[PDB]
Amino acid sequence: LSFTSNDILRFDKAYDENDVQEFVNLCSSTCEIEKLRMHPWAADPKTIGALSATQLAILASKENEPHYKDAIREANGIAVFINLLKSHELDRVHAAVVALSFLSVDNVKNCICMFESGALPYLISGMKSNIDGMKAACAQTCRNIFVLDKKYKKEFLKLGGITQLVNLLELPSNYDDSQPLYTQLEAIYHLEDFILNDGDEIPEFLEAVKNSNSIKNLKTLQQCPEQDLAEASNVLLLRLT
């Protein structure tokens, strides 16, 4: 066949061998690939770099092989993904968000690494996206990080994270009683996890959530035709009132 880019050959070999470190090294590749879908909302990878980030996300998503989540951290993957978050290429940012969201699940070391490596401002910015999968994944990753340490919650608050979370409570502008309000319900739980330290209410953070559109948005949510959401909204509302 044809001679091809070294990066394409490196990718193909890394793929055959689940070579985590090589995939991380390849995330910086700008080698263009041909048009392809691999994921329900992430933009199609347009380079070997974004494609490598996507394969790493796939490895991180293997429930029955949690060891990949550690291998990826040890390969310096988290710093590499945070760098991709700075990209103006939609597929690079999306792939990094997907990878980081899986890496943050059931892996405290990874969450600590994400905090220490500066992920939060990018993830908080990501909660502003009009793409529901993106905003929900960013919100979940933020939560997985900030529940671990009061200082992480403080930083989240300082960076405007509560503003963005509270905004996730808002209904779509032409809301249709048929469509599920997953992200809204998850955001209720995120806010509770912010306020509470192992079941105990933290006064500072209670006040933070009070000083927002939370009560307004929650009042709107507690009248929706959905028992889980209506009940959850009622519960958090009572706490803030």
Mind listing the domains of the chain with CATH numbers? Answer: 1-241 (1.25.10.10)
Contact of 107 with 69, CB cutoff 8 Å = yes
Q: Considering only CA atoms, which of 147, 121, 232, 140 is closest in space to residue 183?
A: 140
Quickly tell me which residue has 């690079």 as its tokens: 92
107 secondary structure, DSSP code: -
Question: CA distances (Å), 62 to each of 21, 35, 229, in order?
Answer: 17, 26, 29
Q: What is the C-alpha to C-alpha distance for residues 212 and 83, in angstroms, rounded to an integer?
A: 31
Rounded Cα distance between 72 and 144, Å, is: 17
Experimental method: X-ray
Question: What whole-number distance in Å separates Cα of residue 130 and Cα of residue 150?
Answer: 29
Helix, strand, coil percentages (3-state) for the chain, rounded to 5, are: 65, 0, 35
CB neighbourhood size of 93 (10 A)? 24
Side chain identity, residue 130: N
Question: Among the residues of 104-202, which ranges form H helices?
Answer: 108-116, 120-126, 132-146, 150-158, 161-167, 182-195
DSSP class of residue 160 equals T
Tokens standing for 44? 């199609």
Resolution of the experimentally solved model in angstroms = 1.8
What does residue 81 show for φ and ψ, rounded to 5 degrees? -65, -40
DSSP class of residue 44? P
| Rounded CA separation 105/4 (Å) | 37
Contact criterion met (CB below 8 Å) for 95 and 53: yes
Answer yes or no: are the C-beta atoms of 126 and 135 closer than 8 Å. yes
Contact 116, 108 (CB under 8 A): no
- Choose among 180, 164, 78: nearest CA to 128: 164
Alpha carbon distance 153, 137 (integer Å) = 18
